[PDB]
């Protein structure tokens, strides 16, 4: 055939891939963490947006740290051979490098490590997108007038 370029990911597999949305709104009373008013609007907005991009959206609400790890572990062990990509959206409280389950923190590295090129072979070479709505610390941006 003619000249071929390799500059863009192949996104015409039979499936676009999974879009896992972890929507943590209500936290265990034990933790002292406040409910995240407005996060259901986000979760619905994301579900509709990625539906129109032809992702298989799975919405999960109010997961413990153990359930987040088990979910990620299970999803990473699925056969993604027929899928172009993978998307995970995390909506929760957070700190730098950390997302909160309903009962305490999860290292983001623990979540993303399941999808490493050597650990999720049916996603090797495919884009793995992690969209993270959470704080990354306590600094405040005062802005500057333009």
């Amino acid at each position: 055939s003619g000249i071929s370029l390799d500059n863009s990911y192949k996104m015409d597999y039979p499936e676009m891939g999974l879009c896992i949305i972890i929507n943590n709104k209500n936290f265990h009373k034990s933790t002292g963490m406040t409910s995240r008013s407005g996060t259901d609007v986000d979760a619905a907005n994301l579900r509709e947006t990625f539906r129109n991009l032809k992702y298989e959206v799975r919405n999960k609400n109010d997961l413990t740290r153990e359930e987040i790890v088990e979910l990620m572990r299970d999803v990473s062990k699925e056969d993604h051979s027929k899928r172009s990509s993978f998307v995970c959206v995390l909506l929760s409280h957070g700190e730098e490098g950390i997302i909160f389950g309903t009962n305490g923190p999860v290292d983001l590295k623990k979540i993303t490590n399941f999808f490493r090129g050597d650990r999720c072979r049916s996603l090797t070479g495919k884009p793995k997108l992690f969209i993270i709505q959470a704080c990354r610390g306590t600094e405040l941006d005062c802005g500057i007038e333009t």
């Binding site: 676009m16 995240r36 609007v41 907005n45 509709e48 999808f115 884009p127 969209i131 990354r136 600094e139």
Partner: protein
């Protein structure tokens, strides 16, 4: 013959390292509101990093916090695109 195990990840963070990330009780978080709006408008016509750059501009320019506590009032937010991708990403393809 090998690729890095960390290659082909994209982390679309809602805020810069070290910073708070703001959320509205009625409209959702500033970042997710803006991400969804820009995907809806541009996913059939722009590469993903260029979509996310529009998200950065929308969050940066169109939002500012309102708080009864002066400590948290009139604050701004910039999201943070962290790309280990090795190729351009288009959500559409040629039929």
């Amino acid at each position: 013959h090998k690729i890095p195990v960390e290659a082909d990840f994209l982390y679309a963070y809602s805020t810069a390292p070290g910073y708070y990330s703001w959320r509205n009780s009625k409209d959702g978080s500033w970042f997710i509101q803006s991400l969804c709006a820009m995907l809806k408008q541009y996913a059939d016509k722009l590469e993903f990093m260029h979509i996310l750059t529009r998200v950065n501009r929308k969050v940066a320019t169109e939002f500012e916090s309102f708080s009864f506590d002066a400590t948290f009032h009139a604050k701004k937010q910039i999201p943070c695109i962290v790309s280990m991708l090795t190729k351009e990403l288009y959500f559409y393809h040629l039929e």
